[PDB]
Write a protein that binds this ligand. Structure first.
Ligand SMILES: Cc1cc(CCCOc2c(Cl)cc(C3=NCCO3)cc2Cl)on1
Ligand SMILES: Cc1cc(CCCOc2c(Cl)cc(C3=NCCO3)cc2Cl)on1
Ligand SMILES: Cc1cc(CCCOc2c(Cl)cc(C3=NCCO3)cc2Cl)on1
Lengths: 283, 253, 238, 19, 283, 238, 238, 283, 19, 19, 19, 19
């Protein structure tokens, strides 16, 4: 286990045996792909192979090393104000839970229909000094599940978190991180959906009727400062203890908007990664 | 079977009809244990002569009635023996039995909600930080409200029912030990209740542990002569009364 | 000493973490814990006790008590309807209820539920209502037949007095959200006359029914969150 | 990892258990 | 234990067995709620149920996960002064122990008559820079039980804490936290009371005759600085190893003042969460 | 190395914590500890030794010694009263006492207490006082009968000389506060004449009684705190 | 306490590290995990399923479907050539393929590969193509003879319909780079006519062949990296 | 041990048994206090007691929880100078070991004749910024036993501590703490003394002939800075592993000066805590 | 070094294993 | 957790015990 | 103290040994 | 607590012992 796990030799690939010639009836190279199945032909079948003892692990080819990597999924921003502190909808951020809200990683999952996981969340606040001294800028992140009082503005009553989670980070002390159970009323997170809100010819349809999990209302606790700032707290996300069901063809068209598939670009012709050739005859 | 018989002193009560009986927090009232105790003197425990069936002052059930309460440690501040031992001692501890009688006919329609409540800190009727007055949370056999009128100069509680007098939607009140008196099945209501308090024996004078409330939910409705009065009578029995911290004697108020 | 690496999360503070802290007041031996009749250990318990339902959720009634009774009337017509409320346990009239008040402390709910009704009528009086649970899928039924088609219970008013209607758990998602959500729509429950309210001579012809809701052993909640049903648009003084 | 009441007093300890 | 405790499957709910029809005498659906008891009817009773093996824990529905969550219960503030340092009643805070002093969490307990617990106290100082440089602002919190010399002003003799507790926090070093035994002369904390100070028709009556536990006199040790500041040290509180007795109906009227029940708003009609319906007939 | 997480409380300082610290002066072998007659191990011990009570807590007397004696007088009347003090062990005259002085170092107290009185009278002299403990509940008694009704001890002055009066523990709260508090009011103790002070010829007719208070094995304190009874409105020089 | 030394790396953050974190939401018992038909555990699986190849990688064709078919034609001449593509699995036409699309998530690839072709011709139709794998070393062959000299497979179109051509693994370095690299050049594969496409009367004379590529159990990848084949020259809205 | 020690139930008090009446000869309530001994009478003796099983520990009533608490015993101060650095007797503090140098805690011990202990010393430097930037102000504390070169001024040769102890604290890094063996040539620390230096009618007499243990010469290593400061390094002290012999009556007169008993105030009449009553008859 | 789930909950733990 | 005198000397140790 | 590969991977470890 | 030469080399270790 150790060795196998430390040496990373858990999932090893078979070796390529030796072959000889075959002047025989059964032709393995011939199958009818219309059966929708996949061929089973190998080196040893087609050629006069040798003998190679392999030693490549398919460890890094596991839904956990494919998925289990932290990725920017949101960049909370706060261009503070000292003029009006508090006021409605200010100096505090709120953002709806999700992804589809950002490619590269969105891309990645979408490779599967259903998915399930606990996550390694990490907050990377970066304090840009627009003043001659930033002081001590404390911070409060927290989670607002449904249906819950989402701060109208900066000091509601909801920042008491008498029964909510609020993580606090003060300049110097390291990046806040933490983790989380798999939050869904369903046995898995619906990375897609072919359902609607209802029969209302104006109902919602997508990944989304099924993902009302939150939002995040933010706060820079410290009170009024003299010299201004702007905070940019980056939100990274990692999938730990993941499972996946029914793979899908990757995405080749740059999306737009989340919780939707829509590609149809604003005017520009739909572009894809495929390159053009002069002729099939020369590559 | 519904019939019930109860014997407490030299006194007994009967009821040819009933809705079970209820034991508050499923605990039966009893005497204090040398474990949870604290005091050091030998408690006087009047048996029978004290923990017997005292009946209070009766009341009228109106189509205008709003509700009436009695505070227990207090309702018997006059009831012989118990209510003397109360005044002669500092520490008092005791549990009760509440027999609520209210009959009328099978041609009547009405519903009373009866409930006991541990620490029933009432609210004042007036905004502020002024708490209800002593002298008004210490009515006596007579009880309080009815739907009465009074000086607003007095640091007077809330005559307000629906808020529970404490400002908790009555109806969640069902959380406190209770039962109703649906004149179509019921006749009485019987609550039995042990001694609940963070202390082994409290001050029978400063602190009322149990508070009892009776509230007309569905208004009394007959088609008879309003010559037909349908009282509501409450009877109570200290049970396992225990006293201690003997001395002079307090004073009536 | 021990070559250590300080991990990302280190030094933070979470209103939700299990960690130890030096206890100021060393050597303190707290007051013993005497015995006290009735101690809780699980919200559940409180959730299984039927609390009364405000249903007469109507205008002037509302700030009063009546706001709790439902008078069963005349009804010239027949097969007429009484009331309706929707099941989404965080929805006035429900919400405020010991249950509701609670559920509003968690993000998700589940299981069956129990509705109980009581006749504050008369003795010589008689009636028969039909109560029904119309699962999520369509609109609260306009007519009885339409509603009788799904889950229901005919209630014979008699020497008993209390009929308890169960609300099975019908859902796609093992779990439902406590927060208003078109998806997690639990459905409606309604009540209608089966027969009438017949009263022999010189008995009133309107009477009330109280209604309640307690949980089922089915029941269970999760994901604690701060409540809905209470905005402290204070502060609070001294 | 657990039951390592790094501190003496009992008042200082994690959230209790369940039973 | 582990699994059951790590998997959080300690308190599991029963499953819903299968039923068949019943054309029988005993009617479980009929009980008389006037008995004050609660019905015992189930799915299986009322309908023709199926068979569902459950898997929901009532773990998070425990007085410890209901109560055991940190909540703002006080926000100590110090608008420093350099003009007059010391002086009487300045630059040092003192506050009486309590709650009722703040909703959301106050609300929460109040759900029960009696309560008992040890607590996880955490101090979240936030230093607002009103100057061009905050220096090194050290801090001293401490606890003044009864009857004890409460600092008249900033440097009394009581800040020697020869036998008191004073926690010290210096800008940078993390949040001060610590904990505490259950402090009451009584076997439980009286979250309510129907007692008074005495027979004096002017005596006190409430939760409060029974909660003379303290106060907190504060101090910013550092001495006189040049560039001003304002400190806001937030006081969070958590209940660990809790017990509760005799539940109560929640609160629906916004309170005012603490150690009292009083609702009666200043003029405004008493408002509650209940909503109004046009008709009972349609929901 | 060891992936560690630094917890909230970390780096703080508490005047009340049990932690180790590198010892400067390594390799130091302290002077041996010779044997010394009388070593304490518990405040309690000190609390069980009766210290004298200032009770003649009156005007000019106070800065002197007399402030300790209580002269038993004439008394033309009969059944008259001597003195009174209240039990709340942090209340002058009590306070200053080895006990009081102490208790004022803790927030809470409990158990029984012992009051002892001694006759510095004569030999040929005689008397009989009645001492009483009036538990918390009412007012210090104006009259003897009223006070005799509760806890007391008749004291026959004779060849003995010292009568010790116990103060049982009567309270609601297992524990009482050391700080003045209307709630935690322990009560009053008073002394009156049962008979008189008779003296045969040519003996003085006034004489004194000393009074004291030591603890009971009942006794116990908690929640250490800094004292009351001493304000260093100094400083202190050189 | 434990004399510790904080190591260099301490306090950092890596998008690639295995460490634990306090879980907010303590005591949460997630929805059970019901059974669901078809769950993956390894990219590999997806890599072994043959996905179709865009090869008609030509002009107007490209944005359409045709971009997938290869019509086998007339051919006046004989021994003429059909098409060619190069093996470097991250090279349009390959790239976009379930495999390619993937491989582009890792820095290095290895093993054998499988190309399969299918005749969407007719029944009465006949043909014989020669497919060949020209290992890395020289230029994609201009002529058949030259290409037939290396690895190949003659394909007899018949009642079967699908011929699968294996691409052995020939390389110096156990491993090849997924990124375009002159060194790690995998080679070319091409197809030519062996005979012709003969069709009896009144049958079309052009027909198509679809082509595919799935992996071999040989196969394996490593060094995960972010993809090539997708530039989010967005953002993404709402 | 654990439980008993964690539950803090080590020293428990007896319970109050039950009594009955006694119409008997031996009168326990009668003893003659002149014997100098203490009565032994109890509840059970005097009254008709009941039965109370106790549960109060005399744990917190131990010379270790009575003594073992940190207390300010000195406040080293340095009003830096940049004008003249070094110079004689500057920018470096020195202070003689002791207490008597400060009440509340002085008070506390003095409750006993002899005492013995190892100590938990903690230094709480606080840097007040009197400048627009405090830089990096390093610090050196150290101990100068007798007879040893006590720095004449700031950089002597004694700050090399080739064989002395010097603890170093740099702004940010936490409070310096450490501990110490019981330093006395004697088997115990003389918390009093009725001895003198000699027969010289001008010899010293007190706690003090016996406590020539030190002094502390201080230093702010960093060199010359631009923007001024003032440092206030507080010295707390804790008694760990303590023993005490022959208790004494507490102090009721505010002292003056240390190593002496002297009370005699400057003019003011000697004041004590005792309060005056109108009459003994009413309390 | 391993299997020392310093934290209670399971959701908090390292990347799972492989089998 | 206890008796781990991380330091050599005895003078350095927690508050003693009780007996 | 040793062989406590606090980290999973082998590439992460101390300087190897000698033999 | 002791003999935990957290470091490899011997030159790195506490003050030796006594014998
Ligand atoms: C699809 C999909 C993705 C997710 C994840 C939900 C978002 O997860 C977070 C939560 Cl619940 C809280 C926080 C957070 N709370 C305070 C700061 O950040 C961050 C994330 Cl990524 O759910 N369905
Ligand atoms: C009701 C009720 C609530 C409490 C808790 C008492 C307040 O608890 C604290 C104490 Cl004793 C001290 C401190 C504190 N000391 C220094 C800083 O904060 C904070 C709290 Cl919340 O007691 N009865
Ligand atoms: C009486 C009596 C009190 C003491 C204690 C001696 C003072 O203890 C200290 C020593 Cl020796 C050194 C330091 C110290 N050295 C560098 C900084 O502080 C502090 C104290 Cl309190 O001895 N007799």
């Amino acid at each position: 286990n150790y060795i196998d796990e430390v040496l990373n030799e858990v999932l090893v690939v078979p070796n390529i045996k030796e072959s000889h010639h075959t002047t025989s009836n059964s032709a393995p190279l011939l199958d009818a792909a219309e059966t929708g199945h996949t061929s089973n032909v190998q080196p040893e079948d087609a050629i006069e192979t040798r003998y190679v003892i392999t030693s490549q692990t398919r460890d890094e080819m596991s839904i956990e090393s494919f998925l289990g990597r932290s990725g920017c999924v949101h960049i909370s921003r706060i261009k503070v104000d000292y003029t009006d502190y508090n006021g409605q909808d200010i100096n505090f951020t709120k953002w709806k839970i999700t992804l589809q809200e950002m490619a590269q990683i969105r891309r990645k999952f979408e490779l599967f229909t259903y998915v399930r996981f606990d996550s390694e969340i990490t907050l990377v606040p970066c304090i840009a000094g627009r003043g001659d001294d930033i002081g001590h800028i404390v911070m409060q992140y927290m989670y607002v599940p449904p249906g819950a009082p989402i701060p109208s503005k900066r000091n509601d009553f909801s920042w008491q978190s008498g029964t909510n989670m609020s993580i606090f980070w003060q300049h110097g002390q390291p990046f806040p991180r933490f983790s989380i159970p798999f939050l869904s009323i369903a046995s898995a997170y619906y990375m897609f959906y072919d359902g609607y809100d209802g029969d209302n010819t104006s109902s919602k349809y997508g990944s989304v009727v099924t993902n009302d999990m939150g939002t995040i209302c933010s706060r820079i606790v410290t009170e009024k400062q003299k010299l201004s700032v702007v905070i940019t707290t980056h939100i990274y996300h990692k999938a730990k203890h993941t499972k996946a069901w029914c793979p899908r063809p990757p995405r080749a068209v740059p999306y737009t908007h989340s919780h939707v598939t829509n590609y149809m670009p604003e005017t520009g012709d739909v572009t894809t990664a495929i390159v053009r050739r002069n002729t099939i005859t020369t590559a | 079977d519904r019939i019930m018989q109860i014997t407490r002193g030299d006194s007994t009560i009967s009821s040819d009809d009933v809705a079970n009986a209820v034991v508050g927090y499923g605990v039966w009232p009893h005497y204090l244990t040398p474990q949870d105790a604290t005091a050091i003197n030998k408690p006087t425990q009047p048996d029978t002569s004290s923990n017997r069936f005292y009946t209070l002052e009766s009341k009228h059930w109106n189509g205008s009635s709003k509700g009436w309460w009695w505070k227990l440690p207090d309702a018997l501040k006059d009831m012989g023996i118990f209510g003397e031992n109360m005044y002669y001692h500092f520490l008092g501890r005791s549990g009760y039995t509440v027999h609520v009688q209210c009959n009328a006919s099978k041609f009547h329609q009405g519903t009373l909600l009866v409930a006991m409540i541990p620490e029933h800190q009432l609210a004042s009727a007036k905004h502020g930080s002024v708490t209800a007055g002593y002298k008004l949370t210490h009515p006596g056999e007579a009880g309080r409200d009815v739907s009465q009128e009074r000086d607003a100069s007095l640091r007077q509680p809330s005559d307000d029912s629906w808020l529970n007098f404490d400002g908790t939607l009555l109806g969640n009140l069902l959380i406190f030990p209770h039962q109703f008196i649906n004149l179509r099945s019921n006749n009485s209501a019987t609550l039995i209740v042990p001694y609940v308090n963070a202390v082994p024996m409290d001050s029978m004078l400063r602190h009322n542990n149990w508070c009892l409330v009776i509230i007309p939910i569905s208004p009394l409705r007959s088609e008879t002569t309003s010559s037909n009065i349908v009282p509501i009578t409450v009877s109570i029995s200290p049970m396992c009364a225990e006293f201690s911290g003997a001395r002079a004697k307090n004073i009536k108020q | 000493g021990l070559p250590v690496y300080i991990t990302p999360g280190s030094g933070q503070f979470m209103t939700t973490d299990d960690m130890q802290s030096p206890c100021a007041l060393p050597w303190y031996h707290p007051t013993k814990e005497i015995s006290i009749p009735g101690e809780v250990k699980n919200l559940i318990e409180m959730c299984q006790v039927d609390t009364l339902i405000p249903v007469n959720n109507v205008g002037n009634n509302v700030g009063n008590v009546s706001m709790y009774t439902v008078q069963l009337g005349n009804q010239t017509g027949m097969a007429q309807k009484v009331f309706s409320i929707k099941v989404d346990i965080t929805s006035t009239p429900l919400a405020t209820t010991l249950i509701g008040e609670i559920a509003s402390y968690y993000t998700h709910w589940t299981g069956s539920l129990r509705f109980s009704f009581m006749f504050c009528g008369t003795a010589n009086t008689t009636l028969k209502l039909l109560l029904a649970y119309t699962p999520p899928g369509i609109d609260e039924p306009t007519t009885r037949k339409d509603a009788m088609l799904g889950t229901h219970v005919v209630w014979d008013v008699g020497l008993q007095s209390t009929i308890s209607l169960v609300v099975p758990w019908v859902s796609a998602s093992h779990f439902r959200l406590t927060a208003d959500n078109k998806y997690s729509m639990a459905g409606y429950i309604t009540c209608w006359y089966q027969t009438n309210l017949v009263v022999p001579p010189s008995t009133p012809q309107t009477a009330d029914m109280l209604c309640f809701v307690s949980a089922c052993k089915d029941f269970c909640l999760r994901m604690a969150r701060d409540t809905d049903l209470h905005i402290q648009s204070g502060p609070i003084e001294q | 990892y657990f039951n390592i009441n790094y501190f003496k007093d009992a008042a200082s300890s994690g959230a209790s258990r369940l039973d």
